[PDB]
Amino acid sequence: SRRRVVITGMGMLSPLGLDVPSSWEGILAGRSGIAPIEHMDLSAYSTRFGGSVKGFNVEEYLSAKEARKLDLFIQYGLAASFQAVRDSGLEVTDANRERIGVSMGSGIGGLTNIENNCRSLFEQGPRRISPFFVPGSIINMVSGFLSIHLGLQGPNYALTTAATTGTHSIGMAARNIAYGEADVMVAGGSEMAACGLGLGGFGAARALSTRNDEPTRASRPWDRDRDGFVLSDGSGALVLEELEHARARGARIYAELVGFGMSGDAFHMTAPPEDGAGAARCMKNALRDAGLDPRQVDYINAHGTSTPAGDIAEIAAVKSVFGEHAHALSMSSTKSMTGHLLGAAGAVEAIFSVLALRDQVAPPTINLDNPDEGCDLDLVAHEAKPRKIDVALSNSFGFGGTNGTLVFRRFA
């Protein structure tokens, strides 16, 4: 029926590094990217730390002139996208430009730009609003600007599914390729929600960790003293490519994208069901899509946000799907180190899943000092674990009960 999809390029901005290799080095070393926020005064907020991108220079990617019209989340998405395309070695021509598209998403988009324009509006009226405000702030402009810069004329769209955005973006891009609508897609997500509205909005819901005294210990998935997620910024992008297309041009293949599953909890606007039933259906859908039995899974990059309800639901879901094999696989949350990159989480975590396959190493869950009741799987506590990994699964779950799972496999 359908064509095979491989990963030929990757790119990233994260709290651990300004590219993929630097981020991954941090991941394998168990390094935290979390620190007190420097770019605003959070004296009035109950959370004053997060995962910032440190030392980003947009002028590596864009002229200063172009960059000034774009919200940070667009700058970040473009940086990761450009990295991924260069990493792939793909040359865009008239013969293929209609076959190359883009699906880069975001959970909340240009919140910083909105906040700044809203200050001008209230203080001075609508005349001080930027002419570039709309195109420089809306979520589909990563896809838009990337297509313009690289001459990409294929399917051009953007997902916004909260914390599931990056996973859905990659999965649906893979579908485009499998079904023949494109031969190449740049896919993933980006987020920069570290502004007053973001910190204040999540804080108002009491969803964020408030461990201001020890920011690097705040994100502690499955630990009994977890107290909410850590807000982080950045971007991940992957070049997905039809297999024969990749082979014909001698592309370096990182891994194969073999499965994509989706589900809805239909339970609650922000909380998962305690048994993770929706997450279970999603993982099973992804495995069925990949033609894999649960027992063939070696590594799970969990969603693992460090929220009370979320973390335990994901354990329940994994035990339901995997049975006894739940105790043979390794499962880790790299959010322990990166925090929660929101709409970018699924994108950077897809990249980490691919690199786990490349390097045959399960990244750690740092800060897992005291696993909570029932959190008795191999959660790769504290230190990276070299091991055999043929199949890696990556989960994302989001507000609205919206679930996504990707399955990657070593490529021969």
How far apart (Å, rounded) are the C-alpha atoms in residues 18 and 308?
31
Instruction: By CB under 8 A, name the one of 29, 67, 150, 243 that touches a second copy.
Output: 150
Whichever of 326 and 342 has its CB closer to ligand ZHX, that residue is 342
Two tokens at 407?
């399955």
Instruction: By CB under 6 A, name the one of 96, 232, 307, 394 that touches ligand ZHX.
Output: 307
Q: Could you tell me if 48 and 379 are in contact, meaning their C-beta atoms sit under 8 angstroms apart? A: no
Minimum distance from CB of 164 to a second copy (Å)? Answer: 8
Q: What distances in angstroms separate CA 217 from CA 28, 101, 204, 392, one per listed residue?
A: 17, 40, 22, 26
How far apart (Å, rounded) are the C-alpha atoms in residues 242 and 176?
10
Whichever of 264 and 291 has its CB closer to ligand ZHX, that residue is 264
Residue 328 binds what, of ligand ZHX, a second copy, none (CB under 5 to 8 Å, by partner type)?
A: none
Touching ligand ZHX, residues 201-220 (CB under 6 A): 202, 207
Determine if 210 is a binding residue for a second copy (CB under 8 A).
no
How far apart (Å, rounded) are the C-alpha atoms in residues 316 and 90?
42
Minimum distance from CB of 383 to a second copy (Å)? Answer: 35
**E-strand spans in 223-271?**
234-242, 255-264
Residue 397 binds what, of a second copy, ligand ZHX, none (CB under 5 to 8 Å, by partner type)?
A: ligand ZHX
Whichever of 118 and 328 has its CB closer to a second copy, that residue is 118
Helices (H), 62-110: 64-67, 72-88
Minimum distance from CB of 54 to ligand ZHX (Å)? Answer: 22
Q: Could you tell me if 354 and 389 are in contact, meaning their C-beta atoms sit under 8 angstroms apart? A: no
Minimum distance from CB of 7 to ligand ZHX (Å)? Answer: 24
Whichever of 29 and 150 has its CB closer to a second copy, that residue is 150
Touching ligand ZHX, residues 214-273 (CB under 6 A): 229, 272
CA neighbor of 211 nearest in space, from 84, 49, 331: 49
Which residue(s) pair with 187 in the sheet? 103, 238
Dihedral sign for Cα 306, 307, 310, 316, please: positive
Touching a second copy, residues 41-100 (CB under 8 A): 44-45, 97-98
Placement of tokens 């946000």 in the chain: 305
Binding mask 154-193 toward a second copy (x if CB under 8 A, else -) reads xxxxxxxxx-x---x---x--x---x-x------------
CA neighbor of 235 nearest in space, from 363, 31, 84, 92: 84
Determine if 196 is a binding residue for a second copy (CB under 8 A).
yes
Two tokens at 188?
């993933």
Determine if 209 is a binding residue for a second copy (CB under 8 A).
no
Determine if 140 is a binding residue for a second copy (CB under 8 A).
yes
Determine if 134 is a binding residue for ligand ZHX (CB under 6 A).
yes
Write out the DSSP string of 299-323: EEE------HHHHHHHHHHHHHHHG
- Interface with ligand ZHX by CB under 6 A: which residues? 107-108, 134, 138, 162-163, 202, 207, 229, 272, 303, 305, 307, 310, 342-343, 397-399
